[PDB]
Amino acid sequence: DVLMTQTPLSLPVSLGDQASISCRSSQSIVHSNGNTYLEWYLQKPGQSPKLLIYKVSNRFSGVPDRFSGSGSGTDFTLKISRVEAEDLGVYYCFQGSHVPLTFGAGTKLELKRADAAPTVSIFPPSSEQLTSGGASVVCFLNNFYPKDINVKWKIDGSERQNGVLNSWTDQDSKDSTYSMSSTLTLTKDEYERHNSYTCEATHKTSTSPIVKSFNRNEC
Amino acid sequence: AVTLKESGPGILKPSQTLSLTCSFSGFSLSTSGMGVGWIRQPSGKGLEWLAHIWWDDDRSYNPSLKSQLTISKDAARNQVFLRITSVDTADTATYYCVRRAHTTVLGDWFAYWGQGTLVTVSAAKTTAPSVYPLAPVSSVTLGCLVKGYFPEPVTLTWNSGSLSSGVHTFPAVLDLYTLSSSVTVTSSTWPSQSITCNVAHPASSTKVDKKIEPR
């Protein structure tokens, strides 16, 4: 299949900034008829995708002239001359030349703000849950920026890879931060077999991990 | 005036056969050069082309799904159909009907897309959530974990909606859903004043108010 590689996959901008997104194909997008069926789509949250550009550089009817597309062959670019608020969302490139038709993975146009360290809170299983043979441990990592963050669970020193469910909020419309919830779910048996529970987060804002912990026996 | 409206079953179980319908107006599929197809997006993921069908009965499929796909049409009724056999949780997605012509004049691009029909695939029976209060071990953070429910949605408020600032309610994740919500208040607020997680799961007629007790 023709792989469509978008660079970057996330692009922080301030309103007014110029913005460029690269799309590269793994083979030529030129059809035997001589046209290059390279298209760019915008999907705003909660809406279907919208055509912006077709055949490399044609703007679709009604599309603002701040959008332009250029390139040839396997190498294509979308440019926004001045980003507006209505432009934020996920941009896909697409090739319609070869079967299967294929999209890039998506480039999220997001807003730039100052770095912000997560506020981290950890929570033991409730009595209610334990009463039922289940034990979940929860860690919230709230209001951070930029969005890249690693969360590690540690039990009595051991690193726990299995049984972790993660969920992210989209960028906050008001303060432009992200938040994340991580839940570690264990059998009650395994919960009662160990004592020290740690949620460990690595982020750009600290050289050293933010560590929040508790000991079961003190609960 | 071009319209595209998709319809599907909403929910289906693995191994079952998904039948989708696109009903359109303001153009004919018997028109020389016209085609209509389907694209899907697994929620929170990217876009995947599935199939296209042409005015002249010619069809194009995504090879990964060839054995599972059938696209067809009733041009007189202004309808295109897609069939997907042996579905699995991996086929959970919004399915979009799109128009695309193979001639420049009629429009060789995905200009017109439906609003999309959501399809969820899971073996789950309606299942009420368990609702768990999360107490801490200048500001204090409390939480609420809503665990093991089907189908979506649940609604979650703090103090019946009275406490609205400082809340982060996280999108649900998975054959059952789990969701969580944090609330951050000034240290003097709690535990002096009560804070309660209110969770509703309409599908199972469930309503639970869970007060956060200090430990």
Binding site: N33, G96 | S60
Partner: peptide, 5 residues
């Protein structure tokens, strides 16, 4: 070889 005149 997707269809395009």
């Amino acid at each position: 070889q997707f269809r395009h005149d």
